[PDB]
PDB file of C-alpha atoms in Angstrom:
ATOM      1  CA  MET A   1       0.000   0.000   0.000  1.00 13.93           C
ATOM      2  CA  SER A   2       1.702   3.199  -1.292  1.00 15.32           C
ATOM      3  CA  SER A   3      -1.230   5.628  -1.872  1.00 16.39           C
ATOM      4  CA  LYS A   4      -0.346   9.257  -2.817  1.00 15.51           C
ATOM      5  CA  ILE A   5      -1.827  10.724   0.402  1.00 17.17           C
ATOM      6  CA  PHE A   6      -0.625  14.301  -0.196  1.00 18.78           C
ATOM      7  CA  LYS A   7      -2.277  14.575  -3.696  1.00 18.06           C
ATOM      8  CA  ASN A   8      -1.909  18.275  -4.737  1.00 19.68           C
ATOM      9  CA  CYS A   9      -1.355  19.398  -1.087  1.00 19.65           C
ATOM     10  CA  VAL A  10       1.304  22.103  -0.445  1.00 19.96           C
ATOM     11  CA  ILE A  11       3.860  22.411   2.407  1.00 21.51           C
ATOM     12  CA  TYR A  12       6.543  24.843   3.622  1.00 21.28           C
ATOM     13  CA  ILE A  13       9.638  24.128   5.805  1.00 23.02           C
ATOM     14  CA  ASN A  14      10.614  26.454   8.695  1.00 20.32           C
ATOM     15  CA  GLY A  15      12.811  26.465  11.848  1.00 23.27           C
ATOM     16  CA  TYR A  16      14.749  23.155  11.639  1.00 23.93           C
ATOM     17  CA  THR A  17      13.561  19.733  10.310  1.00 22.58           C
ATOM     18  CA  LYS A  18      14.566  16.033  10.061  1.00 25.49           C
ATOM     19  CA  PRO A  19      15.728  13.884   8.316  1.00 25.51           C
ATOM     20  CA  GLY A  20      16.336  17.040   6.216  1.00 26.77           C
ATOM     21  CA  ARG A  21      14.318  19.381   3.956  1.00 28.36           C
ATOM     22  CA  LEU A  22      15.410  17.491   0.794  1.00 28.99           C
ATOM     23  CA  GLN A  23      14.370  14.090   2.193  1.00 28.54           C
ATOM     24  CA  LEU A  24      11.008  15.492   3.367  1.00 27.95           C
ATOM     25  CA  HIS A  25      10.445  17.255  -0.002  1.00 26.56           C
ATOM     26  CA  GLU A  26      11.110  13.903  -1.739  1.00 27.00           C
ATOM     27  CA  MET A  27       8.549  12.160   0.555  1.00 27.26           C
ATOM     28  CA  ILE A  28       6.059  14.901  -0.434  1.00 28.86           C
ATOM     29  CA  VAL A  29       6.610  14.370  -4.220  1.00 31.27           C
ATOM     30  CA  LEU A  30       6.678  10.522  -3.852  1.00 32.92           C
ATOM     31  CA  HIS A  31       3.235  10.835  -2.210  1.00 29.82           C
ATOM     32  CA  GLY A  32       1.928  13.246  -4.914  1.00 33.44           C
ATOM     33  CA  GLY A  33       2.157  16.546  -2.957  1.00 36.06           C
ATOM     34  CA  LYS A  34       4.020  19.809  -3.644  1.00 30.41           C
ATOM     35  CA  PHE A  35       6.389  21.890  -1.476  1.00 32.18           C
ATOM     36  CA  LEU A  36       7.703  25.479  -1.448  1.00 34.84           C
ATOM     37  CA  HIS A  37      10.990  27.000  -0.197  1.00 34.55           C
ATOM     38  CA  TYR A  38       8.954  30.084   0.908  1.00 33.35           C
ATOM     39  CA  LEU A  39       5.469  31.062   2.182  1.00 35.01           C
ATOM     40  CA  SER A  40       4.190  34.301   0.633  1.00 34.35           C
ATOM     41  CA  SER A  41       0.587  32.954   0.610  1.00 35.35           C
ATOM     42  CA  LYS A  42      -0.052  32.969   4.420  1.00 36.12           C
ATOM     43  CA  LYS A  43      -3.788  33.370   3.571  1.00 39.25           C
ATOM     44  CA  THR A  44      -3.790  29.781   2.100  1.00 38.81           C
ATOM     45  CA  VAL A  45      -1.372  27.890   4.405  1.00 35.15           C
ATOM     46  CA  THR A  46      -2.045  24.138   4.107  1.00 35.53           C
ATOM     47  CA  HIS A  47       0.793  22.747   6.311  1.00 33.33           C
ATOM     48  CA  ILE A  48       4.225  23.844   7.571  1.00 37.61           C
ATOM     49  CA  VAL A  49       6.815  21.417   9.010  1.00 37.34           C
ATOM     50  CA  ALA A  50       9.063  22.862  11.714  1.00 39.31           C
ATOM     51  CA  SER A  51      10.503  20.570  14.407  1.00 37.03           C
ATOM     52  CA  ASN A  52      11.452  23.631  16.542  1.00 37.61           C
ATOM     53  CA  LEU A  53       9.518  26.942  16.223  1.00 36.46           C
ATOM     54  CA  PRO A  54       8.671  29.230  19.233  1.00 36.58           C
ATOM     55  CA  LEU A  55       4.886  29.112  19.885  1.00 38.83           C
ATOM     56  CA  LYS A  56       5.016  32.837  20.839  1.00 42.17           C
ATOM     57  CA  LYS A  57       6.539  33.731  17.429  1.00 44.25           C
ATOM     58  CA  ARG A  58       3.902  31.516  15.742  1.00 41.92           C
ATOM     59  CA  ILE A  59       1.058  33.487  17.405  1.00 40.49           C
ATOM     60  CA  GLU A  60       2.873  36.822  16.759  1.00 41.37           C
ATOM     61  CA  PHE A  61       2.707  35.969  13.010  1.00 43.15           C
ATOM     62  CA  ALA A  62      -0.785  34.466  13.726  1.00 41.41           C
ATOM     63  CA  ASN A  63      -0.576  32.738  10.270  1.00 41.64           C
ATOM     64  CA  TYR A  64       1.510  29.532  10.778  1.00 41.60           C
ATOM     65  CA  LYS A  65       0.376  25.958  11.591  1.00 41.59           C
ATOM     66  CA  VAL A  66       3.651  24.174  12.220  1.00 41.24           C
ATOM     67  CA  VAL A  67       3.589  20.372  12.355  1.00 38.51           C
ATOM     68  CA  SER A  68       6.159  17.923  13.789  1.00 34.77           C
ATOM     69  CA  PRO A  69       7.645  15.302  11.353  1.00 33.49           C
ATOM     70  CA  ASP A  70       5.815  12.456  13.200  1.00 32.54           C
ATOM     71  CA  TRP A  71       2.611  13.414  11.311  1.00 31.52           C
ATOM     72  CA  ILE A  72       4.141  13.163   7.803  1.00 33.23           C
ATOM     73  CA  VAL A  73       6.188  10.047   8.616  1.00 31.26           C
ATOM     74  CA  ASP A  74       3.167   8.297  10.195  1.00 31.34           C
ATOM     75  CA  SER A  75       0.659   9.407   7.510  1.00 31.32           C
ATOM     76  CA  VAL A  76       3.103   7.872   4.973  1.00 27.09           C
ATOM     77  CA  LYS A  77       3.320   4.698   7.171  1.00 24.11           C
ATOM     78  CA  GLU A  78      -0.508   4.385   7.397  1.00 21.92           C
ATOM     79  CA  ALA A  79      -0.865   5.416   3.685  1.00 22.51           C
ATOM     80  CA  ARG A  80      -3.665   7.820   4.778  1.00 21.98           C
ATOM     81  CA  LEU A  81      -3.621  11.371   6.110  1.00 23.53           C
ATOM     82  CA  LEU A  82      -3.552  11.733   9.890  1.00 24.89           C
ATOM     83  CA  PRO A  83      -4.668  14.887  11.777  1.00 25.80           C
ATOM     84  CA  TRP A  84      -1.451  16.911  12.063  1.00 24.59           C
ATOM     85  CA  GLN A  85      -3.465  18.826  14.727  1.00 21.05           C
ATOM     86  CA  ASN A  86      -2.535  15.924  17.145  1.00 19.40           C
ATOM     87  CA  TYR A  87       1.178  15.827  15.999  1.00 22.49           C
ATOM     88  CA  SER A  88       1.447  19.627  15.812  1.00 19.24           C
ATOM     89  CA  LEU A  89       3.930  22.186  17.160  1.00 22.05           C
ATOM     90  CA  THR A  90       1.192  24.838  17.562  1.00 24.04           C
ATOM     91  CA  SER A  91       0.180  26.444  20.874  1.00 20.11           C
TER      92      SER A  91
END
């Protein structure tokens, strides 16, 4: 089972991440999603992965929904999307 869970989804990478941005970007394209090296379009954030991002800075921007890598890794493992809102780095 290898379903393209992230079909036409979009992500951004912020703070610091693992295994590395390139590896995570490859997981995204393997599973049919897209990624960006930037986030101009705050108004249409879909996901952000950041394994370290101050919650205070997040709410000062008030436009970021940072997720820990466990979501993406485990959604890939289950070959279905999990709620990142339970594997999040939000407040």
